[PDB]
Amino acid sequence: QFNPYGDNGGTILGIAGEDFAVLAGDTRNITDYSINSRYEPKVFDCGDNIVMSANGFAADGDALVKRFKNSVKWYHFDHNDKKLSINSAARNIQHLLYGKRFFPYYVHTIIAGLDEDGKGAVYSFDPVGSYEREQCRAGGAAASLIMPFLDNQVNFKNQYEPGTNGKVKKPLKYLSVEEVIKLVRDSFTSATERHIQVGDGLEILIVTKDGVRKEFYELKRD
Amino acid sequence: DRGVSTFSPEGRLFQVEYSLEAIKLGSTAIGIATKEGVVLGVEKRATSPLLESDSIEKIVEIDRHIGCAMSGLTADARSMIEHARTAAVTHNLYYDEDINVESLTQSVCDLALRFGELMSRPFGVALLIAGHDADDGYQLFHAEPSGTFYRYNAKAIGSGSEGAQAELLNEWHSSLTLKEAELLVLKILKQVMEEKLDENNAQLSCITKQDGFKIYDNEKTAELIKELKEKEAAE
Amino acid sequence: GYDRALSIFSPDGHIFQVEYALEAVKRGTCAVGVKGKNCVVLGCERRSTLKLQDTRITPSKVSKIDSHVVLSFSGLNADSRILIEKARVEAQSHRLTLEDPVTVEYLTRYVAGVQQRYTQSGGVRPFGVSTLIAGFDPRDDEPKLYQTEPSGIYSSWSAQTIGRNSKTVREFLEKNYDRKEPPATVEECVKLTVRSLLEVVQTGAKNIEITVVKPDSDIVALSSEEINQYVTQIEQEKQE
Amino acid sequence: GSRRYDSRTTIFSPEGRLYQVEYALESISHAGTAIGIMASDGIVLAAERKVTSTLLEQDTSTEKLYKLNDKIAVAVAGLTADAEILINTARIHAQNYLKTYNEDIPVEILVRRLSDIKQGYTQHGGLRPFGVSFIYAGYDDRYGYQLYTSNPSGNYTGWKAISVGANTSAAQTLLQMDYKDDMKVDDAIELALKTLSKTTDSSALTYDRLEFATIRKGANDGEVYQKIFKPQEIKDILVKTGIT
Amino acid sequence: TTTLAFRFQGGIIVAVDSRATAGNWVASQTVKKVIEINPFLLGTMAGGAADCQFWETWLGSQFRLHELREKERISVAAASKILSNLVYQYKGAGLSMGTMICGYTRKEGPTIYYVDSDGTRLKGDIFCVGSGQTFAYGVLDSNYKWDLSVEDALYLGKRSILAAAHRDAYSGGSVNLYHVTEDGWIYHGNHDVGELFWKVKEEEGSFNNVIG
Amino acid sequence: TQQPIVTGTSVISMKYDNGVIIAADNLGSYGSLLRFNGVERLIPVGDNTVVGISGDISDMQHIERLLKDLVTENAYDNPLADAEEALEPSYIFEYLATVMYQRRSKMNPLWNAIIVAGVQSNGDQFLRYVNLLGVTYSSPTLATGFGAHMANPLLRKVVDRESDIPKTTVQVAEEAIVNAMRVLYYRDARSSRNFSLAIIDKNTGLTFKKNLQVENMKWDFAKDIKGYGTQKI
Amino acid sequence: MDIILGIRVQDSVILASSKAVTRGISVLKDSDDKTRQLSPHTLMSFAGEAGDTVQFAEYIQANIQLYSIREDYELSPQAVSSFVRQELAKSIRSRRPYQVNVLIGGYDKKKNKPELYQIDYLGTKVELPYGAHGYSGFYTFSLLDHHYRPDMTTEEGLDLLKLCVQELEKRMPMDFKGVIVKIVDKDGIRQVDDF
Amino acid sequence: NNYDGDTVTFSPTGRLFQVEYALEAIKQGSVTVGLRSNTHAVLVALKRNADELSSYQKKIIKCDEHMGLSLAGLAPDARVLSNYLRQQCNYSSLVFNRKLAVERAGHLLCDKAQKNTQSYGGRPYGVGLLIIGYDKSGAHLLEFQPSGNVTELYGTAIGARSQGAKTYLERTLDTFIKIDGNPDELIKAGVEAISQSLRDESLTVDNLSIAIVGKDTPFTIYDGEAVAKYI
Amino acid sequence: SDPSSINGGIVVAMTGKDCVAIACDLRLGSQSLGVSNKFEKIFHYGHVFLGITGLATDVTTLNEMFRYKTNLYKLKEERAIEPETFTQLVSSSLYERRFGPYFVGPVVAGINSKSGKPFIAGFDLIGCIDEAKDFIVSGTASDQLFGMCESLYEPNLEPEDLFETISQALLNAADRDALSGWGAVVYIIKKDEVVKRYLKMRQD
Ligand SMILES: *[B]([O])([O])[C]([C][C]([C])[C])[N]C(=O)[C]([C]C1=[C][C]=[C][C]=[C]1)[N]C(=O)C1=[C]N=[C][C]=N1
Numbered sequence A: 001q002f003n004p005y006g007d008n009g010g011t012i013l014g015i016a017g018e019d020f021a022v023l024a025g026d027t028r029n030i031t032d033y034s035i036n037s038r039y040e041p042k043v044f045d046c047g048d049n050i051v052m053s054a055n056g057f058a059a060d061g062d063a064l065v066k067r068f069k070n071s072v073k074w075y076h077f078d079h080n081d082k083k084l085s086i087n088s089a090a091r092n093i094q095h096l097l098y099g100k101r102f103f104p105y106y107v108h109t110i111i112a113g114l115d116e117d118g119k120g121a122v123y124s125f126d127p128v129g130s131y132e133r134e135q136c137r138a139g140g141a142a143a144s145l146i147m148p149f150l151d152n153q154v155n156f157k158n159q160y161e162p163g164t165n166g167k168v169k170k171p172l173k174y175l176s177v178e179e180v181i182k183l184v185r186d187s188f189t190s191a192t193e194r195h196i197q198v199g200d201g202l203e204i205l206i207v208t209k210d211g212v213r214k215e216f217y218e219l220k221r222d
Numbered sequence B: 001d002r003g004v005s006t007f008s009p010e011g012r013l014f015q016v017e018y019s020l021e022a023i024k025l026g027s028t029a030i031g032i033a034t035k036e037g038v039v040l041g042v043e044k045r046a047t048s049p050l051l052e053s054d055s056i057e058k059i060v061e062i063d064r065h066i067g068c069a070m071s072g073l074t075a076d077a078r079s080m081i082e083h084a085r086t087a088a089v090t091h092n093l094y095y096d097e098d099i100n101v102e103s104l105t106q107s108v109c110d111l112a113l114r115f116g117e118l119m120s121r122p123f124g125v126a127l128l129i130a131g132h133d134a135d136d137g138y139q140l141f142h143a144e145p146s147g148t149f150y151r152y153n154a155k156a157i158g159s160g161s162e163g164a165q166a167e168l169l170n171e172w173h174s175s176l177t178l179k180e181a182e183l184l185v186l187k188i189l190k191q192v193m194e195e196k197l198d199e200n201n202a203q204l205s206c207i208t209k210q211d212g213f214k215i216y217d218n219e220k221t222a223e224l225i226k227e228l229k230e231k232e233a234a235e
Numbered sequence C: 001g002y003d004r005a006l007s008i009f010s011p012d013g014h015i016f017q018v019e020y021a022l023e024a025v026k027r028g029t030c031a032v033g034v035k036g037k038n039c040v041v042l043g044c045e046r047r048s049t050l051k052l053q054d055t056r057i058t059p060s061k062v063s064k065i066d067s068h069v070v071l072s073f074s075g076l077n078a079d080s081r082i083l084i085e086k087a088r089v090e091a092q093s094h095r096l097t098l099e100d101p102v103t104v105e106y107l108t109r110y111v112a113g114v115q116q117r118y119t120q121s122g123g124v125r126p127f128g129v130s131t132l133i134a135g136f137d138p139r140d141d142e143p144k145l146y147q148t149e150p151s152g153i154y155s156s157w158s159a160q161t162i163g164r165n166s167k168t169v170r171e172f173l174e175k176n177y178d179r180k181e182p183p184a185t186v187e188e189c190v191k192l193t194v195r196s197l198l199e200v201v202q203t204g205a206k207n208i209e210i211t212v213v214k215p216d217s218d219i220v221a222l223s224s225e226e227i228n229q230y231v232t233q234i235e236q237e238k239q240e
Numbered sequence D: 001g002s003r004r005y006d007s008r009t010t011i012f013s014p015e016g017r018l019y020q021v022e023y024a025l026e027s028i029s030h031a032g033t034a035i036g037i038m039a040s041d042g043i044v045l046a047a048e049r050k051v052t053s054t055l056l057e058q059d060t061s062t063e064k065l066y067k068l069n070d071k072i073a074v075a076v077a078g079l080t081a082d083a084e085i086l087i088n089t090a091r092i093h094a095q096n097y098l099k100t101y102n103e104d105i106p107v108e109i110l111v112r113r114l115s116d117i118k119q120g121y122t123q124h125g126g127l128r129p130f131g132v133s134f135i136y137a138g139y140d141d142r143y144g145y146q147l148y149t150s151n152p153s154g155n156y157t158g159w160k161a162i163s164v165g166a167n168t169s170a171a172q173t174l175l176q177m178d179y180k181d182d183m184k185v186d187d188a189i190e191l192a193l194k195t196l197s198k199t200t201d202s203s204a205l206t207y208d209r210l211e212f213a214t215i216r217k218g219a220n221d222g223e224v225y226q227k228i229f230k231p232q233e234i235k236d237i238l239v240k241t242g243i244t
Numbered sequence E: 001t002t003t004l005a006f007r008f009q010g011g012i013i014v015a016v017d018s019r020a021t022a023g024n025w026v027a028s029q030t031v032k033k034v035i036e037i038n039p040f041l042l043g044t045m046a047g048g049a050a051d052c053q054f055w056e057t058w059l060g061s062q063f064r065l066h067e068l069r070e071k072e073r074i075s076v077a078a079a080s081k082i083l084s085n086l087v088y089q090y091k092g093a094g095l096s097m098g099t100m101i102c103g104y105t106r107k108e109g110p111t112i113y114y115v116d117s118d119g120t121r122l123k124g125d126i127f128c129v130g131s132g133q134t135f136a137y138g139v140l141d142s143n144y145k146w147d148l149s150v151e152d153a154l155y156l157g158k159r160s161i162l163a164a165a166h167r168d169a170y171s172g173g174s175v176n177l178y179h180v181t182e183d184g185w186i187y188h189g190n191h192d193v194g195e196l197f198w199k200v201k202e203e204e205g206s207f208n209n210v211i212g
Numbered sequence F: 001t002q003q004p005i006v007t008g009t010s011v012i013s014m015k016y017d018n019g020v021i022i023a024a025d026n027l028g029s030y031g032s033l034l035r036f037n038g039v040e041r042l043i044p045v046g047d048n049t050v051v052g053i054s055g056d057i058s059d060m061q062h063i064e065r066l067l068k069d070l071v072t073e074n075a076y077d078n079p080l081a082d083a084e085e086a087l088e089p090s091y092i093f094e095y096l097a098t099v100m101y102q103r104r105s106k107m108n109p110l111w112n113a114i115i116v117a118g119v120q121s122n123g124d125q126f127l128r129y130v131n132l133l134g135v136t137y138s139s140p141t142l143a144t145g146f147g148a149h150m151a152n153p154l155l156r157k158v159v160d161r162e163s164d165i166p167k168t169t170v171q172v173a174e175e176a177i178v179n180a181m182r183v184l185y186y187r188d189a190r191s192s193r194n195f196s197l198a199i200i201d202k203n204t205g206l207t208f209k210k211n212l213q214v215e216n217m218k219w220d221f222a223k224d225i226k227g228y229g230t231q232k233i
Numbered sequence G: 001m002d003i004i005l006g007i008r009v010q011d012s013v014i015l016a017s018s019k020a021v022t023r024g025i026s027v028l029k030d031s032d033d034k035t036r037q038l039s040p041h042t043l044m045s046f047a048g049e050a051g052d053t054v055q056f057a058e059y060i061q062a063n064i065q066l067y068s069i070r071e072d073y074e075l076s077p078q079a080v081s082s083f084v085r086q087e088l089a090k091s092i093r094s095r096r097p098y099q100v101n102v103l104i105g106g107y108d109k110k111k112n113k114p115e116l117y118q119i120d121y122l123g124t125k126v127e128l129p130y131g132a133h134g135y136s137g138f139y140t141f142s143l144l145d146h147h148y149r150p151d152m153t154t155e156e157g158l159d160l161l162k163l164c165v166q167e168l169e170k171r172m173p174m175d176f177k178g179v180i181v182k183i184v185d186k187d188g189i190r191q192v193d194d195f
Numbered sequence H: 001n002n003y004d005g006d007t008v009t010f011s012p013t014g015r016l017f018q019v020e021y022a023l024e025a026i027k028q029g030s031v032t033v034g035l036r037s038n039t040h041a042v043l044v045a046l047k048r049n050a051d052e053l054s055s056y057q058k059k060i061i062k063c064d065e066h067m068g069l070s071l072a073g074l075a076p077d078a079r080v081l082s083n084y085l086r087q088q089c090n091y092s093s094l095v096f097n098r099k100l101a102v103e104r105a106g107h108l109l110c111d112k113a114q115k116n117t118q119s120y121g122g123r124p125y126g127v128g129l130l131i132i133g134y135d136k137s138g139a140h141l142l143e144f145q146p147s148g149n150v151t152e153l154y155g156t157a158i159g160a161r162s163q164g165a166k167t168y169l170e171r172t173l174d175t176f177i178k179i180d181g182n183p184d185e186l187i188k189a190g191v192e193a194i195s196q197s198l199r200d201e202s203l204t205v206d207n208l209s210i211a212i213v214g215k216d217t218p219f220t221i222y223d224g225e226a227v228a229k230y231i
Numbered sequence I: 001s002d003p004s005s006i007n008g009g010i011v012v013a014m015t016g017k018d019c020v021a022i023a024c025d026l027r028l029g030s031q032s033l034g035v036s037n038k039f040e041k042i043f044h045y046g047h048v049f050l051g052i053t054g055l056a057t058d059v060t061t062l063n064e065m066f067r068y069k070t071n072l073y074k075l076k077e078e079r080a081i082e083p084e085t086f087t088q089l090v091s092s093s094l095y096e097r098r099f100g101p102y103f104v105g106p107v108v109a110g111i112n113s114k115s116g117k118p119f120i121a122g123f124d125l126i127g128c129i130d131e132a133k134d135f136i137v138s139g140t141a142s143d144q145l146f147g148m149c150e151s152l153y154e155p156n157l158e159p160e161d162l163f164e165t166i167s168q169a170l171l172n173a174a175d176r177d178a179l180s181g182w183g184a185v186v187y188i189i190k191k192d193e194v195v196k197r198y199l200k201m202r203q204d
């Protein structure tokens, strides 16, 4: 019997800052126990200061990104070159996903950018289209390894202030772009160590009012 | 006989040009756009005194930020309004936002030329579509059965249109207030109407960013009519 | 399928097929509607060219769309059955989905929408029928009376007439009907309706039908003798 | 293209009439006269065959009277071929109703259905209307004995006595004169034949130029019988009533 | 999931948890399981996250179209039946939904309909839906009265979700409260269970089983 | 849904300083039966692209016809068909990739793994993979089936990352490919000694080599191997 | 849903139907009315798969109410039952069949006789003096076989119905939260509020 | 006369009158100009208003990052045809990862307009289009007629009084073709060309509409104070 | 699960001297639960008799269908349908549902009105005609009926004797089947009279 789904591995991570947003992902692509590519880009600039990644089955992932990029193009045609806001892009992606409810895109989608007040934004989707705005989200194979670390080091969960002993929580001070990139790099280094499908390279896309910048870092190739 | 989608020797579609003549027979409708809002007004024109005039619905809501006035074969407008409301709500569902006034107008105009031997004939009604959005602010459009739409600072359609348009030519400036625009619609409607203008045979409406689209009460319009009479008698 | 555009514009901006459908209404027997303070009455003309008729089984002019709404008409009889059927189906559909019966305005809007659709659809002609739709909204005591016509336009009326010699009976109603004080009782409302028909009918025997509709699905059709008593009282007052 | 050749069968005249319906009615006025008379204890159906021949096999012939079911029958006036299309449709509708509700179809419901089909041909489809007028004679337990008529317009009405086809004006006057409400079947038989005998365009009314039928409760106890008269039985009733 | 809603003197109380799971993995603790359909209508979410979100968001578009067409607020009965009729068309295809449609109108009064992807549509005074529904029912049924103050009713709803959050492994995160009245719904905050549990334990003298 | 019947094994490929190399053996297997010994599985498109196909052979022949038809269609109303508007490797790949994903989405896949090798207009090396699932990826070395497990390791020792491409000559690259084909013949039970090789260089163009054989094989050490453990004779 | 009963006496038809609605492990409601009025003198109770039951009942209700308006006439219980059977007999060979069993209790105003029809989801119709769907009949038919008399009064019918419900409450494992009882006679349909 | 009732009828001299009547609609439309060099291609369009209160009808439509057109005639018909181009440009990008050639775009428009001239019931398109674009063979300018005829040109103009601008370009042919790597000077030549078609009215800030595409220049449209520089 | 044995029931038919007989039980059940004891399985259209066993919803549906078809036949033909012709009509009607069949076991019985010749026939669920001289059997106790008929039957039995033979065949076959019984009916059919007799039998 033919099986229309496959698993290309990989892992992605989105973090929203005060006036910026990042969307990261490793560059490794796999089937079973073989490496297909050590550098296959997974996070994409889709225009309108929006970055996107659809992690899981790469065929469905590429198809979806392709169709959303297309949606942005037609949004400009149909509505007088209006900028597609991050919240509008999110709702549009829900309908793309649910459109194939009974034969789903087998992916975990994440988009990142800035909202209409200029503040950082990250949205997260399941395969059949449910979505929610979040301050922090990891997706894909090593999502279970990374999320707990982010609950602790981004939202200061289970952390309190010395001397008070559990009475006063640690205050939720904001994180700079340099501070976030440090947490992203450590998250992927740690994930690479304990997950076989994560490695080779790390590509981060940073989004600010000025535009979309890229940074690349080597990861362990074993 | 002859085709429904036939061109005339001058390069115009016979049926479209004929539908425009039906619109000239319709009751007057006026729209004025300002920096403080857009005003829409119509002539009700009841055929008999026994006809309950408040049931005459020639000003209609499309969304909270878009209103619409009609003139001509008003029965034809019902399916156009239904499409407009569906388009407005559908876009909000797909994109989690209000739809641009121009994009709504364009969607309505796409129906216009879907006729042949689809529907059997063009629409016999013209629409004034007024609204607001964050990109282009307060806007007023004129949608025809040809499929063409023009934006306007001010516009009049119906039987007293060319007389009203000439009046709007002189009166409109870029610093008009909303109160000034309301009175200006009432003034011009009173000028072109057969019967004497009152709160029962004429209807006002506006669209603002704050309050959205509102059809005016008969008590509210009556005061604006009384305010008009006094200021004309003042000089 | 037959796709021919039968309803089309003319150089002077008229759709003749829709206008000729109104001429079929002009030919039809007269129908009248009058709403009082707590009731609505529908009067209808029966042409007496047809005797040896079986009045038990002959299709009546006033039709119940639901238990609280009625519909009378003027024009082609066969065409009216199609509108009545569609209306009756939509009434049950509304109850099924919204869990509430139709408002008189909604039912009218539906029937008017059907009529309009037949003015710009291929291969079909317009309905040669104008209707009077009357009743009371659910849990509401305010009377409702609406009119429709082939073009598809509709509106509410304090009182209205359609059909042959409707110009005359509308003239009568315009001077006799006061808005500030409408017919307070059932008697007064029926009397005014019979009076208006007597301006046109001929004989007051089996030529006048009357149907009274009251709030909360209270609909009844008057008999020959009951109507004949109204006919008797009107003329005896007139002899003065 | 094809528009050039379209007659446009479903349009209004400037006076608000349907051309094709009016012209179809003109066709029907030349057809053989058919009469229906309703009595307290039954219904009569009488009809005149059109200029026959001596070489026409009469005992196996049927052009006027048709059976829709055991309770309902029709008299035809117009194009026989058109009528048979409708008759078979009506026979099917009656069987659909019986299968659905397990009860015989009420007369009016069957009449309304056929009449609605005729209406459709006047409003849409671009086809010519059926050139047929029916007299329905039937019985059900709601309204009892009933007489209806339908015409190409799709309009139908109920009657105590009625005629269709040729010379209806003359025929209807004669029926209006002699008909009374307390009348019986045997009397109604005589009235139907006497009316045809006076309105006929033929020199004399004979057994070979007629079709006759009765719907009686004259069946053993509470039930209804249809009788389509045989040639010899029409000959006998002509002698009995004193026409030959 | 644990979601509840109940009628009382001061209108309707709606309370939900925040947890979403994929197997044993906790996918999200910050899920918005109450949908703001309009200023007068709320919908609860249980079962499939996507099915519930998509169709309850869609649901608001149908209602908005109703009041545009009819110039009148849609009834809770008509509202719930639009959803139930829709899912009935998809019956068999594998939709997974357990929902309450809650609102208040002049003609109906405070009304709650349970709507279900099997097609089940039920009017009622009290409903609890989700994997932790049984836990919430215990607290509600023993403490429910018609004559409750808005303050006391809000707490009962909050406490019932807390009960289920504790025991049910697939419920937790935080509690979202809503109060539905004559003049619409009113949001009553996000309450983290990590802080709410210890607060309730201390003040109420409950959960003596657990050590603190 | 189907099952593959007549099948083709590994296709291997890599990049080098001025272009790309690709290779595949000439066998069409029918299960364990090595049925057809003269099957060409590298199919050139123009003078700048070579498409290597593995998997079901009937589906390969269908794809071959689609490509043949693609060249014909591109020439229609195209005065620059042999110049600026000629078919690029990137165009040919994206077309196939579209078809493969569409067919998997109708639950009726083309049972293949495909590698499109070529050189673009601007001289850039093109090498990308696509299969029955519509999955796509690019890498300095690409291989299908058994090649993925055995060839890639060897080829990655020559070009391990992007920066190793300019440092790799055509002679070094062809040597690595030919060696990999020998290793596959040692170790793949559905491979043959005969194979085809294709080079696409930005300077010297397309070179297509047929009827190549695996040579310089080591077997002499077999004579010393006796029994399965304890046996001495 | 679970238990639905019916009994035809001298001058009326009595239908009894459980109040519980159980979805899985919990009883979501204990006051559910598993019946719809098809016409003034015809009542239909129902039980089967969730959703399908109400959807089917209201669909039938709408169709009969449409007939009533069109003809200004109430169909006989026999005619309504035949319509319902055909809809189910059509349904059983559909893509997704209606999984619903019904009892139709009506008073025929023409014959002045009460009538009870039992129809299952396959479209299997039978006229009976007393009937039941599901596991209900396994307990109740033995009692009715003993006590029923055709000429029982309505009060005697209710007592015999109480004896049936008592037995069900004793021997059935599922708590069905009692029954809603409705009487159908010459004067129409009414509900017994205390049972 | 007797042979102009529909599009399915030739006249005795072999003419299609319905197509010719559609061609007339273009002549009634407002003037628009198109010209190109080797590096850039430019569209200049005179927009028309209903009155002083009204806006000026838009004339230029974008089809892709590298292609677009200007219209003259029935605006809705231009919307239908430009929508078709958008789809075809898009099909080429999604399927073949290939920017659609301007010449092949003209071929597709030609074949779409043709079907409407040979079948009963339908009608010809009532609009003329000027398509500009930059593809793998450099800058291009096309002229579309609803008869189906499409023509590649260095420069051209369509609409009312378009003959004046067409003559100017015919003189300036040798000059403006050489304007390489200078967008502003190529627009100046386009603005000076359309000026030869003006009578009574002149080019104001909300009257003029310009669009450009080139080597390192995506298809962009200029309106309002952005064209005050060229007045 | 098996559609042909959910409800249960039997039908048997026989020929005699210038006569035919057809008989059936009265049970309708839901597997083990006995629901009705008044479910007759023999219907007639004019002088042609049809007995149907199997799934009860189909028994009812087919009866209504053959009433529909025989009524239209009579209106067009102007005569009652004969047993030979009706047999062909049943076969046609069943085979048109070849791959979605009615789960039934029909049995035709009657005397041809012109020739006077006695006629019986049986069918499978999809149309195949069994036209026996002696007897036909159908239902959940068909095996039992085959055994009874094969031993009790002799040719050229007089009407009143044929009644005893067919009655004893049905009764004793039904008493060896769990899903048959609960009453029984026997039709004796002569050229112009038909007698219907209800049999007293054990009610378990
Ligand atoms: B609740 O448990 O029903 C919850 C409500 C939902 C709206 C967030 N559902 C889930 O958590 C389901 C799994 C499930 C658990 C228990 C019962 C039924 C279903 N999870 C999801 O739908 C889901 C969605 N996206 C990511 C992960 N999980």
Ligand SMILES: [Mg+2]
Pocket: A192, A193, A195, A196, A197, A198, A199, A220, A222
């Ligand atoms: Mg690793």
